[PDB]
Amino acid sequence: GLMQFTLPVRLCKEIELFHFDIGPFENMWPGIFVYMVHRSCGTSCFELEKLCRFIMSVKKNYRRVPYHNWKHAVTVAHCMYAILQNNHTLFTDLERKGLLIACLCHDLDHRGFSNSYLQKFDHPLAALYSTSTMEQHHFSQTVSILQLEGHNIFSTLSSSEYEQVLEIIRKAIIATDLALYFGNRKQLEEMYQTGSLNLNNQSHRDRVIGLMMTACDLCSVTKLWPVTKLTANDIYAEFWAEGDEMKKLGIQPIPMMDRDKKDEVPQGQLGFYNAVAIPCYTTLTQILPPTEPLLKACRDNLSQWEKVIRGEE
C-alpha cells in the first residue's frame, strides 16, 4: 500500500511523454507497467501481489515472435497510459482499470500470423471464431488467466462492476481487429463533424475506446524515427514469414508479405500512413485534443518515409 514504484529520473520524465520507448531491459517492463497502473488508476486499484502474479502469467503466454510479443503488449499499455494521463477527467474509475489490462492482454498468444492466414490455413480457431478470429482468441486467453488461482485482480469489484470491466476489456480487445477500425473511425468522423458525438452515450464511448485501442496498437508509427524505423523491421519479419507460409499453401502473397518485394516497402508504408494511421490519430485528436502529439509524431514518420523514397536515406 505504502510501497510506491519509482523509476530512474530519465524514465520518470520520459514515460509521461507519448513517444516513450520502454527500452531493451525486459525485467524492468513489469515494474514500468505497475508504475503506470499506480499513477493512472491508484495504489488501491489492484492488490500488488495479485497484479504481479497476473503480469507474469500474461508475460508467459506471449510468444517469441519478432513483433507480436511481450514488448508490444507493454508498449501498447504505455500509449494507453499517456492518453489517460492527458485526459484526466474524461474516463471512469473502471475504464482506467479495464483499458490498461486490455492493452497488456490485447495480443495474448499471438503466433505471428493474421486472421486471413488462419482462415486460408483452415486453422481450428477459424472454425470456433469466423470474424476477429485472433482478437476473440486473445480475450479468451485473458479470461483464462483472470480465472487461474491468485490471478483475479478485480476481486474487490461487485459482480456487476466485474461484468462491466470484462465487457470493457472484451470490446477493447476486439477493437484491435484493424478490419473493424475503418467503419468505427468513419462513424466517429461523422458524429464529430455533424456534432452528434456524445460521451454520456455508452454506444459512443465504446466507439471512442475502440479508436484509442487502434491508436495505441499502431503507436510504433508515433515514436522518434530511429524507434519507428527499427520496429518496421520487426513487423515485416512477421509479414515475410506469413507470406512464406502463404507461398507454402500455393498462394502468391500480397507484395507486403513477399520478402522478394523489399524495394516496394517505403511506398507500402506511405499507403499505410495515408490509409490507416494519419486518419486514426486525426480523428482521435478531434475527440481528445491532448492526443495531438500522436498525430505530430505520425506525420514526422510519414515525412521520413517520403525522404527514404527520395533516396536522401
**Residue 232 touches which member of Zn ion, ligand KJC, Mg ion, none, C-beta under 5-8 Å by kind:** ligand KJC
Residue in 218, 287, 288, 295 binding ligand KJC, rule: CB under 6 A = 218
**Residue 5 touches which member of ligand KJC, Mg ion, Zn ion, none, C-beta under 5-8 Å by kind:** none
* Binding status of residue 136 toward ligand KJC by CB under 6 A: no
Which span sits near ligand KJC by CB under 6 A: 5-13, 161-169, 241-249, 269-277? 269-277
Taking the complex as a whole, the smallest distance from the CB of residue 246 to ligand KJC amounts, in Å, to 13
* Binding status of residue 221 toward ligand KJC by CB under 6 A: yes
Taking the complex as a whole, the smallest distance from the CB of residue 269 to ligand KJC amounts, in Å, to 6
Taking the complex as a whole, the smallest distance from the CB of residue 186 to ligand KJC amounts, in Å, to 14
* Binding status of residue 135 toward Zn ion by CB under 5 A: no
CA distance 258 to 185: 29
Residue pair 242/253 in contact by the 8 Å Cβ criterion: yes
Q: Is residue 137 annotated as a catalytic residue, yes or no?
A: no
Which span sits near ligand KJC by CB under 6 A: 28-36, 155-163, 185-193, 218-226? 218-226
Residue in 7, 22, 251, 256 binding ligand KJC, rule: CB under 6 A = 256
Residue ranges of the annotated binding site for 3',5'-cyclic GMP are 68, 269
Residue in 40, 141, 142, 176 binding Mg ion, rule: CB under 5 A = 176
Query: Which of the following is catalytic: 68, 78, 137, 138?
Result: 68
How many CA atoms lie within 13 Å of 253's alpha carbon, on the beta-carbon side?
A: 23
Residue ranges of the annotated binding site for a divalent metal cation are 72, 106-107, 217
Residue ranges of the annotated binding site for 3',5'-cyclic AMP are 68, 269
Cell numbers representing residue 63 in the block: 510468444
Which span sits near Mg ion by CB under 5 A: 23-31, 97-105, 174-182, 302-310? 174-182
CA distance 22 to 279: 26
Secondary structure (H, E, C), the chain: CCCCCCCCHHHHHHCCCCCCCCCCCHHHHHHHHHHHHHHHCCCCCCCHHHHHHHHHHHHHCCCCCCCCCHHHHHHHHHHHHHHHHCCCCCCCHHHHHHHHHHHHHCCCCCCCCCHHHHHHCCCHHHHHCCCCHHHHHHHHHHHHHHHCCCCCCCCCCCHHHHHHHHHHHHHHHHHCCHHHHHHHHHHHHHHHHCCCCCCCCHHHHHHHHHHHHHHHHCHHHHCCHHHHHHHHHHHHHHHHHHHHHHHHHCCCCCHHHCCCCCCCHHHHHHHHHHHHHHHHHHHHHHHCHHHHHHHHHHHHHHHHHHHHHCCCC
Residue in 95, 107, 109, 242 binding Mg ion, rule: CB under 5 A = 107
Residue in 67, 70, 95, 107 binding Zn ion, rule: CB under 5 A = 107
Which residues are near ligand KJC by CB under 6 A? 178, 217-218, 220-221, 228, 231-232, 235, 256, 268, 271-272, 276
In the complex, the residues that contact Mg ion under the rule CB under 5 A are 107, 176
Active site residues: 68
